[PDB]
Design a protein around this ligand. Structure first.
Ligand SMILES: O=C(O)CCC(=O)C(=O)O
Ligand SMILES: O=C(O)CCC(=O)C(=O)O
Ligand SMILES: [Fe+3]
Ligand SMILES: [Fe+3]
Ligand SMILES: [Fe+3]
Ligand SMILES: [Fe+3]
Lengths: 317, 336
């Protein structure tokens, strides 16, 4: 159903060794030299892994893929943290952050948001006690709402990379693609027109902030999507757009799949071909909870220049 | 302008790599070659990779050149009389592969379905029958400076020009934007949507003739530009170090917009007067940032005897997926 790649022990050992070597060689990501070297360093990954990801990227066909069987040394990585703030970067799991950064260079360029997790290029995803009953990344008890990442945003991620340091209770990530066959030729044409408002999140000078846009784009035979139901509205008078939006929602909602990122899995989500979400789970808060790392990938770093403080920064805002 | 000069050791390494890859791969008709390009480019000398990566990330200079490649003249052979009908791959396939590797370090090579048989690597040499045209296979006529496809939302992000030969040292003109010669008020105007940049009709089926529903959709966005004549900016990105898109021939400054006229003239003078002659000599590879520089080519006299100036050209996009609406399939790298 969805292509994936399973590392041999030899590949897993090569990758682990590489990330350890790299971690000892470079300070943190605060080293501009590491960010420079990223694509060259990523060419030291096993060739089969490079070829698989390049095929996924170019095939432009599936909403996600997974590289399975990485060796994520649990003792070295240590206990899942209580919070991301006040925590020292780099931590003992730096090799794994570096792994995801190497992967982000094979896909495009890593970038981040200056006001998010202190502007770290690699984000943490783990249950936080205080942020518990909020439906955000560091939450536990809720979600239920799949999304394109930053659907409102002109420079939103092209891909997301999620590396599962641990997932002992097999908590799924929801991911859903667009099945076009349940959708009429007329509704598709409407969804391609700029007839919808996608509002910004409460996360995030110039803003900017204004127009109305499409939900579907790219090829009409195999469309890309920007879908965030919670933040999306249709002017009341546009009954055709509302009709087509209703049909789109029903098709995407009913096709959502549960994708479990297990320990040693790296999940790649294509932000144009899939929406994703997370499901509620009871956290333990003992230091053994689900811990993912996350890196956002842009195909074209220069396109977001106007929202970046300098030419060199990869942080928007 | 920073440039990189290869040592004889680096040139030899680059040459040997391109000959090895030419031997291992069929042609560019192999989709496996296209998949492998960025990994193959990691086999280039490290100093070259570091240099281009710095150029790309610095986002500061509008061109750069890597000088001193070994382009074996006896192997490459005579400059062709036409691009049409040639046996592929040609004996110059290693130099074509070289540009392709460079293109993978900058982004993705792409082309245009109606240009040079859809080849990803273009030829630039004089064709007798084109002697009187203002185009790449011309000679006698000046090719006036331009951003490549200024009108086009999926225009090249970079251009790569490799000189297989240039015996008379014909310059490629290249010009950047000295921001310090423009008033803050002029800059503000250039950033505003006040200018019309007309689509070059050679990109479009000029025909308002419905050859399939599929084809019409591939050109609808450009057709909308022609139909609606949106006004757009000439400068964009950062106000302090802006990108620009400038093709004077296709640009219309609206008659009544006095301020836009004043701003444009000042911009045109700054760019025109800053133009430089960049000679891409044998074994040079010239890299043009299509957001930070305009380019063109000076008149010259062709001999049509197999000894003429011969460049190869690869256009680069930072985001192949952005142009999906204009490509026949997900897999194809050709717009139109
Ligand atoms: O925790 C997950 O599996 C996904 C969270 C998410 O939506 C995101 O990180 O964008
Ligand atoms: O021949 C040259 O040096 C440049 C011609 C040109 O304008 C181009 O290839 O885009
Ligand atoms: Fe998300
Ligand atoms: Fe966001
Ligand atoms: Fe040109
Ligand atoms: Fe053109």
């Amino acid at each position: 159903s969805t292509p994936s790649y399973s590392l041999t022990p030899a590949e897993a050992s090569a990758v682990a060794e590489l990330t350890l070597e790299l971690a000892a060689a470079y300070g943190s990501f605060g080293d501009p030299v590491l960010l420079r070297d990223l694509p060259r360093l990523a060419a030291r990954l096993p060739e089969g892994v490079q070829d698989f990801l390049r095929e996924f990227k170019l095939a432009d066909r599936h909403g996600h893929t997974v590289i399975r069987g990485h060796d994520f040394d649990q003792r070295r990585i240590g206990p899942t943290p209580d919070h991301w703030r006040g925590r020292v970067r780099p931590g003992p799991e730096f090799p794994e952050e570096l792994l995801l950064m190497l992967y982000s260079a094979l896909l495009g360029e890593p970038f981040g948001w200056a006001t998010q997790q202190d502007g770290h290029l690699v984000h943490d995803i783990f249950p936080i006690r205080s942020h518990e009953n909020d439906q955000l990344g560091m939450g536990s008890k809720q979600l239920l709402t799949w999304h394109t990442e930053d659907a409102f945003h002109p420079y939103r991620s092209d891909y997301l990379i999620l590396g599962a340091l641990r997932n002992p209770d097999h908590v799924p990530t929801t991911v859903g693609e667009l099945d076009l066959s349940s959708l009429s030729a007329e509704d598709i044409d409407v969804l391609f027109e700029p007839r919808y408002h996608i509002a910004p999140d409460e996360s995030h000078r110039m803003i900017d902030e204004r127009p109305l846009g499409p939900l579907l784009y790219g090829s009409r035979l195999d469309p890309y999507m920007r879908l965030d139901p919670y933040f999306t509205s249709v002017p009341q008078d546009d009954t055709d757009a509302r009709r087509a939006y209703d049909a789109l929602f029903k098709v995407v909602d009913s096709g959502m799949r549960e994708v479990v990122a297990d320990q040693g899995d790296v999940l790649f989500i294509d932000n144009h071909r899939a929406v994703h979400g997370r499901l509620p789970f009871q956290a333990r808060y003992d230091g053994t909870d689900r811990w993912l790392k996350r890196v956002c990938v842009t195909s074209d770093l220069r396109r977001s220049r106007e929202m970046r403080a300098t030419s060199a920064t990869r942080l928007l805002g």
